[PDB]
């Protein structure tokens, strides 16, 4: 019954379903986690907002056309204005976060096309002068 194509993800008050997935990637084989005492740095008791902020936020959609060359976002930038995550981000000097990224694009059995979806650490880009 269970399938590599069918998945549910629940975080906080939010749930995603998909019926045509292709497994899932865990970047570098490592699930996110909290910061251990033996690797800690700032000494103030941290805020851990948990369900208020650790939940799915859906960005404005973009349109894929035959002429599209692609899209980029940065993180945590893309979520800076998202509910309580954004508030916790901006009220503090320091923050860390992992992510579940879910990119959605359905069509039909008669459409064709392929999107590469990449998560890039330190995605530094060239300037235009």
Residues that bind Ca ion (CB under 5 A): 48, 50
- The H or E element spanning position 86 is helix 83-91
Site string for other proteins, 22-41 (x = CB under 8 A): ---------------xx-xx
Answer with the entry of other proteins, Ca ion, none that 40 interacts with (C-beta below 5 to 8 A by kind).
Answer: other proteins
- Least distance from other proteins to the Cβ atom of residue 18, Å: 38
Q: Which residues are annotated as a binding site for Ca(2+)?
A: 48
Determine, following the binding rule CB under 8 A, whether residue 96 of this chain makes contact with other proteins. Answer: no
Site string for other proteins, 40-59 (x = CB under 8 A): xxxxxxx-------------
**Residue closest to Ca ion, measured at CB:** 48
58-65's contacts with Cβ under 8 Å and 24+ in sequence apart are 64/105, 64/113, 64/115
Residue owning tokens 């033996």:
38
Neighbours of 12 (CB within 10 A): 15
Distance CA 62, CA 126 (A): 23
Distance CA 86, CA 81 (A): 5
Binding site for other proteins (CB under 8 A): 37-38, 40-46
């Amino acid at each position: 019954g269970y399938s590599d194509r069918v998945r549910q993800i629940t975080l906080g008050n939010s749930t995603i379903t998909t019926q045509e997935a292709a497994n899932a990637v865990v970047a570098y084989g490592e699930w996110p986690s909290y910061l251990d005492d033996k690797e800690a740095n700032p000494i103030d008791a941290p805020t851990e907002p948990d369900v208020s902020s650790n939940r799915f936020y859906t960005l404005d959609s973009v349109q894929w056309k035959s002429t599209s060359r692609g899209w980029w976002w940065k993180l945590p930038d893309a979520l800076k204005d998202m509910g309580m995550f954004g508030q916790n981000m901006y009220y503090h000097y320091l923050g860390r976060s992992g992510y579940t990224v879910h990119v959605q694009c359905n069509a039909s059995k008669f459409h064709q096309g392929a999107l590469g979806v990449f998560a890039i650490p330190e995605y530094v880009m060239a300037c235009n002068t």
